[PDB]
Amino acid sequence: TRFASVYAWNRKRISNCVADYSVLYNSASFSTFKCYGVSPTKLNDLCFT
Amino acid sequence: SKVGGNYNYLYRLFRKSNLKPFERDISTEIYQAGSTPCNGVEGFNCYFP
Numbered sequence: 186t187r188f189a190s191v192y193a194w195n196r197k198r199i200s201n202c203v204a205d206y207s208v209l210y211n212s213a214s215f216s217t218f219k220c221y222g223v224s225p226t227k228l229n230d231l232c233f234t
Numbered sequence: 235s236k237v238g239g240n241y242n243y244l245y246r247l248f249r250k251s252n253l254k255p256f257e258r259d260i261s262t263e264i265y266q267a268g269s270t271p272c273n274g275v276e277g278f279n280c281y282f283p
Contacts, residue, residue, distance in 0.1 A: 218267055220267070224250075225267050225268065
């Protein structure tokens with residue numbers, strides 16, 4: 186519903202779950218996508234901590 | 235060093251894979267970071283290395 190400001194951002198912890206970003210294709214329409222330190226195509230075959 | 239910045243120095247930023255010691259890569263082309271083909275034209279998700 187609402188977001189935060191620049192001077193006071195937010196932090197959330199996500200753990201113990203399976204990574205599947207394919208549900209964003211039907212609704213989400215992004216405008217920027219850049220990755221550092223990992224290949225975008227290899228994200229399905231790795232783990233994140 | 236000169237007024238307005240010297241813009242004759244260029245470096246690579248994006249590549250699909252890693253290099254090898256003592257190897258040169260002068261192939262300049264547009265790169266796709268997503269699943270939609272770039273179609274040879276810079277635009278969304280298409281950034282020049």
